[PDB]
Design a protein around this ligand. Sequence first.
Ligand SMILES: [Ca+2]
Ligand SMILES: [Ca+2]
Ligand code: NA
Ligand code: NA
Lengths: 307, 304
Amino acid sequence: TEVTVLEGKTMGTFWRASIPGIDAKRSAELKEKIQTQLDADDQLLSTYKKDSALMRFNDSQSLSPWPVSEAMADIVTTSLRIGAKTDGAMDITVGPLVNLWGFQPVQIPSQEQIDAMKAKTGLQHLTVINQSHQQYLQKDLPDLYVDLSTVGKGYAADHLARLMEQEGISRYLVSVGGALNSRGMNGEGLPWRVAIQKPTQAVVDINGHGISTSGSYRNYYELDGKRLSHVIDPQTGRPIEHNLVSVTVIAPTALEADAWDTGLMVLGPEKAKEVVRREGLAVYMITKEGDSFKTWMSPQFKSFLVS
Amino acid sequence: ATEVTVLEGKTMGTFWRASIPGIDAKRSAELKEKIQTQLDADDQLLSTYKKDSALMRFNDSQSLSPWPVSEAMADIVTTSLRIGAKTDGAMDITVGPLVNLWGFGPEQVQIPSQEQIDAMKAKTGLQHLTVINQSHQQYLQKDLPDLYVDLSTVGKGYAADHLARLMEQEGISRYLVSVGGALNSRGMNGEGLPWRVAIQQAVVDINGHGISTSGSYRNYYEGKRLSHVIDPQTGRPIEHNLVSVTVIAPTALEADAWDTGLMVLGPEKAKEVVRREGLAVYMITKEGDSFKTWMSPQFKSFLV
Ligand SMILES: [Ca+2]
Ligand SMILES: [Ca+2]
Ligand code: NA
Ligand code: NA
């Protein structure tokens, strides 16, 4: 059967929904629902909009529980846990440190300034409180600053998938930026096509899962022998220096994948592989070694490959 | 055409099954061991019939302060409380004392007076339980010492989802796993077709999804007696004619949570929730000697 592709803009990037063919009125109605939901998610999570739910929390100096939506609570919960499991490499409180660099560095902070700033960051400073009819965030530092840009697209893709289910669409491939979520087979009873970066192509079936990628071998800045990156390691408060070009993660949700791919990118190849082993993650890595790109997959990732 | 290996065993007072194509005897044996070990651990985490389960340690405590639990415990309870809210209290993981008052637990009295029921209701309610999450730790907290939490209505869905995680960990991409009536389906069977999932036979294809069924069987094969399903709000047996609910959801845990709540609510109130939440649901009602069925549009999308 045929396929309808809807596309639009959100979160500084694009969204796409590929679904079984629907009629024109149905397609228009669905696109309106999708854009409305994504607009609301952007308004929930954005740091750019000073009136977002997130930015209202940031602007509050309260150390008491702060009411939030179920989505906010769950995004932060997942972020804190994957933060913990990547030894702090995935850190949604690192904003103040990032703000020191203007992210080649053009304005560089001293070691003293870095140290002063990391005192206003830390995953330990956040708590999520869930109850039946309400939920909260709580910070123990008034000027803690939370930034969800590294996990927002993954959530948005998951939420987009749930919207499809609610609309009686149980076969789909949806995406927000590089974060994808898919369930069910395509019109020909085969996996929805999800292609992986081939640096020199591998295809995966992410049915029942989400996938997300951090980095690209086509946006890998490198001067002399040094990596040039605007990605700040939250434990050093400095840009990463390793040769991990891109990391792709398949996880049970795109939110999780989006959190993992960020943490693993920060950790770099050796430490990322230890986390991948420990957690049994499905991961694909591209590294730059001399004049060649090298690829690597965990056993769990290989199981998702299609032929 | 490739051979499907079927592994089965006991867990949580019921049985589990895993169907996996193209797997050899050595791998099957290793996989059965891992499955049983994991399910044993999930039973040890959740069971109210195991005196030293993680859950029973919490239940036995009189503490009103945060109580450390596993990530899985935190998420199961969070999911349960929210779906409890969205079913207007019908799905209630704190209803145990009322069920025990009637003696309607599976492993066990006089008919209680309404006065006694109402007094017992003071020891129950979704509002009494909180889940707290932090980077390296998470907690349950009750504001009533004798609150009693029972997760039997969602434990099978969780366990089935957790089995899917194990399949992935083990590099198994095609499978049908089930714990009692909770299942997850992924990929093609040995014949290269979607796993056959039958509802009592109408057939659904739930590839990439989970499913669960809940029912009321005291009169299913007759009515001559009461339902043993207690309405958490009245503290009395349900009086409506809904005898089975099947839910298809992205996860078996969600499915298992909804099917219990919808079952308690009954046909009219369940349909309201199903519409508002856009759920994929199949309902069986028994009027007198005649069964009637109803499917939401979202459920119909899964029919073959
Ligand atoms: Ca990310
Ligand atoms: Ca249930
Ligand atoms: Na700090
Ligand atoms: Na009560």
